[PDB]
Design a binder for this molecule. Structure first.
Ligand code: SAM
Ligand code: ZN
Lengths: 106, 53, 81, 80, 103, 93, 80, 97, 94
DNA sequence: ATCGGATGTATATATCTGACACGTGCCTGGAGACTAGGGAGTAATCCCCTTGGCGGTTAAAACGCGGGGGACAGCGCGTACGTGCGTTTAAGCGGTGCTAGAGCTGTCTACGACCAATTGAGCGGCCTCGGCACCGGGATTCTCGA
DNA sequence: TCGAGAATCCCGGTGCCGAGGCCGCTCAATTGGTCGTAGACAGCTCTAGCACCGCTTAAACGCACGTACGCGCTGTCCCCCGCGTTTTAACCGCCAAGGGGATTACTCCCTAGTCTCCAGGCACGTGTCAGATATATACATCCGAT
């Protein structure tokens, strides 16, 4: 009887680094798009509505959050569609079917 | 949220812990099915057709 | 400010898709995705700018984006909601 | 022995006083593990469910002692 | 001189002002809000009744029935977005068959 | 017996301008009444929230204009705001 | 009381519904699946209908209660 | 003697049903079903006549719509039949599950 | 400066009685604040809509109960209504 | 592809009702006029925070390539689905009866808005130290080729 | 099948900044009291939801046959991934300025609110013609043989 305790070149095959990036991103919680390109994209899109806006620095950021939480979610759905068609790749005809079923195109 | 932040060896509730506490439940998930919790990340999940054999 | 949508580069889309759970991207996704994102951004910033020019000011606040989001079904917690 | 090692200079003794956590046997394949949380600034031993556990199932757990009535499919003859 | 005629409308500006007041929307209803709202509602009901009548005419009838409102709305491209979630009763479906199915 | 008000007669007066010889049935008139109610409630609710945001209490013809710009789709918004401003102009004189 | 009345949604009825929706060759296991789906939808709507009735101290489910129950779920209905 | 080719009566029925506006499910068994589902929430329920039909109407515009999506999923898998693993995808994508 | 308000101190007083040693961050505090505001608006809006259909002119402690029982899912509804009625009883008899 | 026919659908005349459209009273919601008051419009101004620019650096993007896993096409087997026919069965329709419960009206009162004086809860500004991010060096696991 | 090497987790040491407590100071929540009215409630009327009965007849069920499509397998080829090298601009820190977002101070005019006056819209009948069948027949589509 004794006291118990709690303590005392290379080339990965294709498809394994992906299954590792999935696990390392599904556990992180940062933003996955560069901040200056998204800044400029938001400013450039808002030209078509009013010429010279000033975009308080918390607005832009806000958008980015949503812009991730949309795309990510979208991809989830598209994934299923791919797996439904008995394949592993996700194709543009998957995104379109997800957006159609989900109501964004009708 | 506190249960999560403790089972993660921290002592400060943080947006990721609220996202976990919500999306891991089953009824708090329907009350907040449309919201997005800023800086909450996503829940770990990998399909079974994708895991190697 | 012309042709900035190319700023949503390929690795960013790869990372978003990894967090989404997909394993083997195609090669054509990286344009369908920019189209989708541009459509979403137009639909949101239109209402944001409406909310911000109804109040007779020239600065898109964060409450304006929060309202423009909540109005389309997608709320957003954390930015003064 | 019901002794348990909190850290290098402190141990828990549940031979005469303790919880029903003294009724969990060592198995070569465990379905529960033991972590060391710190609540209120003090270390405590909690038991987490390693893999899913169905009802009316015995709670296995690895002692790590460093004979064995293991009874597991794959198993070694020593608790040590 | 009713306040609708003074604007050149057919919708009851008085009744819309009453509804806005008694619907618990804001503390003090403005003056030219009911006029604007009645004009908007009239424009929309005209825009939908025009296509409803058109659809009912091509089918060689003189009475508009829910089938014709269904057709008028779903065939349009911006009313189908306004009424994106409604289910007009006795409306039916827009005839369409996927190309893969027909031989 | 029991008095219930509806938008039947106004819908009829508009039908007699867009098609001077057609006639709505009963079910279709009920549907048009429900449609007018729905759109009224949408626009009124959006104008209410839009006044609450800027910390005001008067719901004036600016809030209804902005709510029409928000709710109605691309093209219907333009013609609706045009008809509205035309009617308020022809009313304030 | 009534029991096992879901079987009244026959095979030709589901068949005609699919045909209106555009289907051309229905599988065999579908009928049970759509019976379950229809039962779930009906339960979810009638729950809110009955809540709206109870709140008004009535014993008849009005038509406006069903309309409000449907509207509260983002499925409005014109004609009642 | 004579026999329509297997599957050609399908399109005839498709065109015949997409063109009408009648109610496809029999009215009385549906009344019984809706009347007995509500037995789990109260007991002395009366179900005013125009309510049931209301429900029924909605409860058709759901199923039809759902099938309009199910077909797509079937067509996605290079198929014609709609097997019960299509309804589940079509209900999980739109967030109903 | 103008003083704006929130639910910070009350969320903190609740955290210091559910987990007497944990402490919330700042962004998580703002998230909990916006969550409370959102649920407040949902419940009060449904309660109003419900106190309108019935032509009542007031929004009483029963419109709120039916609103809570409509919006909240299956089991959260029972516990929510129990806590509510307990609080209202403990308040009226005092 | 070509007919021959066989089934189904579309066209047009007859007729038959019941639901839509119109005219009538009549009841109350809408319009006019006037006043008081507070909410919103307008001028001053101040200081926050957004924009713009610049230098370094280094993290991340871009590009090219080799190849192995995956998408896609092509066939056989066989079963389970459609179509047609003869049965059963209960839906639908009409007609009766009746009683529960919605609905509307008058009487009364308990309850919430409104207003005044006040006072302590909480909100803003000041420290400040402990939790957490960062770095480095062990052990510890996992994948892959042999 | 097991070595190896690449990735991952865990244990200490360290600095720093924001989470939390403290102090003054408002201003909004508290208490008390009044007063009008929203609604509770007892009661009566009437309609419409529920249940039953008889016929008939259209829709549902069971069964047979046969064939079209699901599907499992095999086989190309091609393109997306993993990795290494070169290039770019994101990011961080910093400085300067000025627009416009808040806030304050007056003022006035737009709307609630009340009383007076009446006409428009809603329930109620009555009339007829628009559409639903019904029948006969013509034209279109589809399937077998060749
Ligand atoms: C926590 S106690 C287990 C409780 C024990 N079953 C009882 O009845 O009290 C652990 C002790 O039980 C015995 N034990 C537990 N698991 C065992 C095993 N797998 N084989 C042999 N002895 C075991 C040893 O004496 C060990 O020190
Ligand atoms: Zn053993």
């Amino acid at each position: 009887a004794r006291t118990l305790q709690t303590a005392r070149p290379h080339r990965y095959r294709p498809g394994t680094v992906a299954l590792r990036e999935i696990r390392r991103y599904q556990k992180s919680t940062e933003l996955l798009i560069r901040k200056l390109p998204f800044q400029r994209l938001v400013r450039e899109i808002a030209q078509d509505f009013k010429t010279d806006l000033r975009f308080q620095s918390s607005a832009v950021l806000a958008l980015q959050e949503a812009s991730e939480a949309y795309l990510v979610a979208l991809f989830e759905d598209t994934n299923l569609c791919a797996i439904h068609a008995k394949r592993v790749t996700i194709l543009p005809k998957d995104i379109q079917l997800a957006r159609r079923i989900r109501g964004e195109r009708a | 949220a506190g249960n999560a932040a403790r089972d993660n060896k921290k002592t400060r509730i943080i947006p990721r812990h609220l996202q976990l506490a919500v999306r891991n439940d089953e009824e708090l998930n329907k009350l907040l099915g449309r919201v997005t919790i800023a800086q909450g990340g996503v829940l770990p999940n990998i399909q079974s057709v994708l895991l190697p054999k | 400010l012309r042709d900035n949508i190319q700023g949503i580069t390929k690795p960013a889309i790869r990372r978003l898709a990894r967090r989404g759970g997909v394993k083997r991207i195609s090669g054509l996704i990286y344009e369908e995705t920019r189209g989708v994102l541009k459509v979403f951004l137009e639909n949101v910033i239109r209402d944001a700018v409406t909310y911000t020019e109804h109040a007779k000011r020239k600065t898109v606040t964060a409450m304006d984006v929060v309202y423009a989001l909540k109005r389309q079904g997608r709320t957003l917690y954390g930015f003064g909601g | 022995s019901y002794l348990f090692r909190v850290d290098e200079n402190t141990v828990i003794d549940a031979t005469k006083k303790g919880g029903i956590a003294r009724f969990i046997n060592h198995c070569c394949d465990p379905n529960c593990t033991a972590k060391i949380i710190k609540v209120g600034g003090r270390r405590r031993i909690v038991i987490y469910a390693l893999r899913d556990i169905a009802a009316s199932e015995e709670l296995t757990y690895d002692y790590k002692f460093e004979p064995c009535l293991c009874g597991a499919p794959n198993c070694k003859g020593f608790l040590n | 001189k009713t306040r609708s005629s003074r604007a050149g409308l057919q919708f009851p500006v008085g009744r819309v002002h009453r509804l806005l007041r008694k619907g618990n929307y804001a503390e003090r209803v403005g003056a030219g809000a009911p006029v604007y709202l009645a004009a908007v509602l009239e424009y929309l009901t005209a825009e939908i009744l025009e296509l409803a009548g058109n659809a009912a005419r091509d089918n060689k009838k003189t009475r508009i029935i829910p089938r014709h409102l269904q057709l008028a709305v779903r065939n349009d491209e911006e009313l189908n977005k306004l009424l994106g979630r409604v289910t007009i009763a006795q409306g039916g479906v827009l005839p369409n068959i996927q190309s893969v199915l027909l031989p | 017996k029991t008095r219930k008000e509806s938008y039947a007669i106004y819908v009829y007066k508009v039908l007699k301008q867009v098609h001077p010889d057609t006639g709505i049935s009963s079910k279709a008139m009920s549907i048009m009444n429900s449609f007018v109610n729905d759109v009224f409630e949408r626009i009124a609710g959006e104008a209410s929230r839009l006044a609450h945001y800027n910390k005001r209490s008067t719901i004036t013809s600016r809030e209804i204009q902005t709510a029409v710009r928000l709710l109605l789709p691309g093209e219907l918004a333009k013609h609706a705001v045009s008809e509205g401003t035309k009617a308020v102009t022809c009313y304030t004189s």
